[PDB]
Amino acid sequence: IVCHTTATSPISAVTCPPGENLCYRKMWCDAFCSSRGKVVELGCAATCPSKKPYEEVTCCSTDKCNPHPKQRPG
């Protein structure tokens, strides 16, 4: 399994720990704060709850499943 880096500056890719595997993203805008969308702090996690965060830590039980860019032409 892989999971995107902490996002220090260059959004790259890194392995997850022996416990953690799923990719998380922490955001306090969830919309469009202009310039750089939302804060979005990447990182690997082990749990994935869900109950209307309003601003909390989301995730996906997979590899690099937090790709914040995902910008591809067609």
Binding site: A7, S35, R36, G37, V39, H68
Partner: peptide
């Protein structure tokens, strides 16, 4: 004397987040 916060990350490249 720039105090400077504990600036976090943004989408990719918002510089030091605060300002």
């Amino acid at each position: 004397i720039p105090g400077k916060r504990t600036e976090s990350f943004y989408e990719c490249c918002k510089e030091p987040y605060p300002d």
